[PDB]
Amino acid sequence: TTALVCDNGSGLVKAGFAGDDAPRAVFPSIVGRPRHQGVMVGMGQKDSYVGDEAQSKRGILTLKYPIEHGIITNWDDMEKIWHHTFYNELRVAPEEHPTLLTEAPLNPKANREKMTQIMFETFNVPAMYVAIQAVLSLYASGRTTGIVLDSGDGVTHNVPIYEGYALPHAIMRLDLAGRDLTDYLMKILTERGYSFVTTAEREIVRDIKEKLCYVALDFENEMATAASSSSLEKSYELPDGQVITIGNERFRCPETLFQPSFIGMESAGIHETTYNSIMKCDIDIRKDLYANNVLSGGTTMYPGIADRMQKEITALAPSTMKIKIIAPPERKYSVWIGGSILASLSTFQQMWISKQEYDEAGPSIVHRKCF
Amino acid sequence: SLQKKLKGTEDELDKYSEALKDAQEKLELAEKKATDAEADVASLNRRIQLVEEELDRAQERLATALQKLE
Amino acid sequence: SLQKKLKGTEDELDKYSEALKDAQEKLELAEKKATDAEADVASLNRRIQLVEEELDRAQERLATALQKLE
Numbered sequence A: 001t002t003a004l005v006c007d008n009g010s011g012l013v014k015a016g017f018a019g020d021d022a023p024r025a026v027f028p029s030i031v032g033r034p035r036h037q038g039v040m041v042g043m044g045q046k047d048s049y050v051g052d053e054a055q056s057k058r059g060i061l062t063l064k065y066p067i068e069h070g071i072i073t074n075w076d077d078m079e080k081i082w083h084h085t086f087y088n089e090l091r092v093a094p095e096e097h098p099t100l101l102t103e104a105p106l107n108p109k110a111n112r113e114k115m116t117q118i119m120f121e122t123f124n125v126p127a128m129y130v131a132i133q134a135v136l137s138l139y140a141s142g143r144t145t146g147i148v149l150d151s152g153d154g155v156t157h158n159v160p161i162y163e164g165y166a167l168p169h170a171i172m173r174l175d176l177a178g179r180d181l182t183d184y185l186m187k188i189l190t191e192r193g194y195s196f197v198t199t200a201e202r203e204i205v206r207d208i209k210e211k212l213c214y215v216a217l218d219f220e221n222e223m224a225t226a227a228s229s230s231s232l233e234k235s236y237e238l239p240d241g242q243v244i245t246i247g248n249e250r251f252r253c254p255e256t257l258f259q260p261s262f263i264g265m266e267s268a269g270i271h272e273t274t275y276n277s278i279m280k281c282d283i284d285i286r287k288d289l290y291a292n293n294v295l296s297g298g299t300t301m302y303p304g305i306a307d308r309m310q311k312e313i314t315a316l317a318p319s320t321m322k323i324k325i326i327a328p329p330e331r332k333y334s335v336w337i338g339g340s341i342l343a344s345l346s347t348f349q350q351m352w353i354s355k356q357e358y359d360e361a362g363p364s365i366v367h368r369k370c371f
Numbered sequence B, C: 001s002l003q004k005k006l007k008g009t010e011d012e013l014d015k016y017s018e019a020l021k022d023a024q025e026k027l028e029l030a031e032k033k034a035t036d037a038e039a040d041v042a043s044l045n046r047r048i049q050l051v052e053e054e055l056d057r058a059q060e061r062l063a064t065a066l067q068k069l070e
């Protein structure tokens, strides 16, 4: 048989068979419902629209995200998302396919318990497993040591790993992610005169952020340059025409990662959290952690993020140490690649959670050695 | 009598519309290439200043170690 | 009637012709900027390796001087 690798993530569901080079189906994790009445008779529109289908009908629907920060809030629509992924995008019955999932570090145990219960009862998969996103990302890069930063749309966390041995006491998890950056961009575009309120226009703001924003190596110098020069403004075309322009907001939005005080967060920037997590570890492994800094996640795809992060870490770390940041082109798909590699291993075949084993041991077995 | 004039006008309109559409398509292609090149060159210019500072204080502490060896 | 539509079509065709001329102008400007950026990046990425080897042997005899001083 073959294994199935599913990555629920947050804001983008990516799934595909184990052993493939890239995920087969990638679509937003969005479930929508029509807020209007509808006058045409015989149309027979169904109650709920899920996946990329709801994106095309954005103007009529309202969008709800079942995942806020890693955790799942609404479970019925989560079941709808999983059913859609299993039946329409992959067109495969999950009755004969083991399923591997990704789960962010430091999340409630009830999340894992309900996930396993749903996957074993509703879909009756023969076996399934849950793995950490950072470990899979380290699998994809081909490394075996080094501290990995996984900044997705839901949560940003650092996991220091040395020689295949994780250090749980040095794991730091931060709630700043892509969704908060999009919300801050919405809040900051009001200054120029553009107002976005409807959840449909959240997607437009997200597209603007993806296609236009960039990270500045130096902040005050860039502010001084933009206050006089006009070479930074770029124009974007809304779906209904009405071209707009944007200036300082082009690079002010991604600065929130390094300046959490912009959105009122107390914590420090990612550049400081990475250094603090490195210093929380031992002293004999800091060379490899410094020299094998790995980036991943969609939010990392900002151009110029690597240079700024390296500059900050070098400004923090001692000058003797060599600081290297690994930024593969396929950052946002690294976790799924690592999951496919992990599920394709021969020695992993005896680490699944079987059906009868779960039945006899109950849902609490997830937290046992079968982590 | 005017039917031929209308047909010719329609054909000309179609021809200029196709030429214009090709013109945009090339314009977005060239613009995307230009922005990608500009981003790449700006990033590597920033690399240039950082390696320049690297090199500068490299000769700084090299010279300091030089008189130390003296 | 048909005369109004023909006049409107002619005026629109003139407008899109002006837009076409602007499109080629912008394309030419973008191409010039692209080739200038290509020359700049060529110079920069043939000087980066010189800077790299420079700092390399800088730290090399930094280490030699340090060990001799010790």
Ligand SMILES: Nc1ncnc2c1ncn2[C@@H]1O[C@H](COP(=O)(O)OP(=O)(O)O)[C@@H](O)[C@H]1O
Residues within 6 Å of the ligand: A008, A009, A010, A011, A012, A013, A151, A152, A153, A154, A178, A179, A206, A209, A210, A211, A297, A298, A299, A301, A302, A332, A333
């Ligand atoms: N090039 C990019 N520019 C800006 N943001 C990006 C880019 N690529 C991905 N993202 C952000 O990453 C988020 C999706 O993260 P992803 O890598 O799919 O993991 P997850 O689905 O678990 O969040 C999106 O919300 C998006 O805003």
Ligand SMILES: [Mg+2]
Residues within 6 Å of the ligand: A009, A010, A133, A150, A151, A152, A153, A297, A335
């Ligand atoms: Mg992720």
